[PDB]
A paper describes a structure:
The FERM domain protein talin (∼270 kDa) plays a key role in activation of the integrin family of cell adhesion receptors and also provides a direct link between the cytoplasmic tail of the β-integrin subunit and the actin cytoskeleton. Talin consists of a ∼50 kDa N-terminal head and an elongated 220 kDa rod composed of amphipathic helical bundles. The talin head contains a FERM domain which is similar to that found in ERM proteins, although it has two novel features: the F1 domain includes a 30 residue unstructured loop and is preceded by an additional domain (F0) which, like F1, has a ubiquitin-like fold (Goult et al., 2010). The integrin binding site is located in the F3 domain and, although a second integrin binding site exists within the talin rod (Gingras et al., 2009), only constructs containing the F3 domain are able to activate integrins (Calderwood et al., 2002).
We also established that the talin head contains an additional globular domain F0 at the N terminus that is closely associated with the F1 domain (Goult et al., 2010). Based on these results, we extended the FERM domain construct to include F0 (residues 1–400) and removed the unstructured F1 loop (residues 139–168), as illustrated in Figure 1A. Overall, the model contains 358 residues and 561 solvent molecules with an average B factor of 18 Å2 (overall) and 25 Å2, respectively. Both F0 and F1 domains have ubiquitin-like folds, the F2 domain contains a core 4-helix bundle equivalent to that found in acyl-CoA-binding protein, and the F3 domain has a phosphotyrosine binding domain (PTB) fold. The interfaces F0-F1 and F2-F3 each form a network of close contacts that stabilize the relative domain orientations. In contrast, despite a similar buried surface area of 620 Å2, the F1-F2 interface is loosely packed with no specific interactions apart from a single hydrogen bond between the carbonyl of Q288 and the guanidinium group of R194. The location of all the membrane-binding residues on the same face of the talin head indicates that they can all simultaneously associate with the membrane, thus generating high affinity binding through multiple dispersed interactions.
Residue numbers in the entry: 2 to 133, 173 to 398
Write the structure that this text describes.
Amino acid sequence: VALSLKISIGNVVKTMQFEPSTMVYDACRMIRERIPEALAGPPNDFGLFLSDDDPKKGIWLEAGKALDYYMLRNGDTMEYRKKQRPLKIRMLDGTVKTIMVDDSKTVTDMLMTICARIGITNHDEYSLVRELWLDHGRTLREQGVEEHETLLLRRKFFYSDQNVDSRDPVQLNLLYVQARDDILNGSHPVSFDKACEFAGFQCQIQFGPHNEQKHKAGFLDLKDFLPKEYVKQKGERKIFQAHKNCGQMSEIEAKVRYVKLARSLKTYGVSFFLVKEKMKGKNKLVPRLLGITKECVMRVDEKTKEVIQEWSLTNIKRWAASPKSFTLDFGDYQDGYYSVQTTEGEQIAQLIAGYIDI
């Protein structure tokens, strides 16, 4: 009724007899009394390990369990193996530190050990991330992480303001979809540079961190990532440099950065109309974007989205629509009406009237 188990240590294999109820912690002691190789380091740096052809499936025995918890049988082998191994962690400043960690611990337990060595007490404001997602309640080993891999130390993201809250993913996703769709469909006009910035975050959100082997030329369908007017361009390299610049940023940080970026623009929350300006004495017309808000009218370059002129709504003296044009009269504020060619004049006139009313 004794269990006869082969103990492997280095190149030694010695069969020892154990009662099936022997606690692992006592079994380790027993081994340390009999094989000098077992004394290579302190007891807490070693344990018993059952290997598997799949390295992911080898398991460390728990000190406080009995051997028979593990269903051990006569002729099985247990390895008395060092738990401590060196793990490369990327710090926040980009440098890489090599820290001794216990292979039998969960990611969470290691992270606590890691933080304490570098002087961080709030270990739960951090997570570890892999270099090509880790459950922090499982071990690195069982998740297929190989010992030569570097992990990154990443601070959990928190941001909130009057507009967005990183703690409420549902609401955040509503605001992100709205801002993104308005940008993709041209409702919110943006420069090419800003479109490509937005699309970098979009890539981060849809694909995760940039992967140079997979996220290569011709990977994106640019019609899904840029306003139409920018598809006829070399946008992909610009988008991927923005994507890359996101590093290991979480999906929620990326959404928050997208929404804040959209709200920072002069053009955000403005109702836009695509109109044309007549050029005196010439046939050409010049496209322009005309924007209206509760506080102002803006004249915006159709290409660059620069605001080239702006007026307060309180400066309008009168305004007039016809079936082909729309005209603003600013009276003594400036010399000359602003008139534009458009078939949407009634609708512009109506938006203005509504704002002036209040």
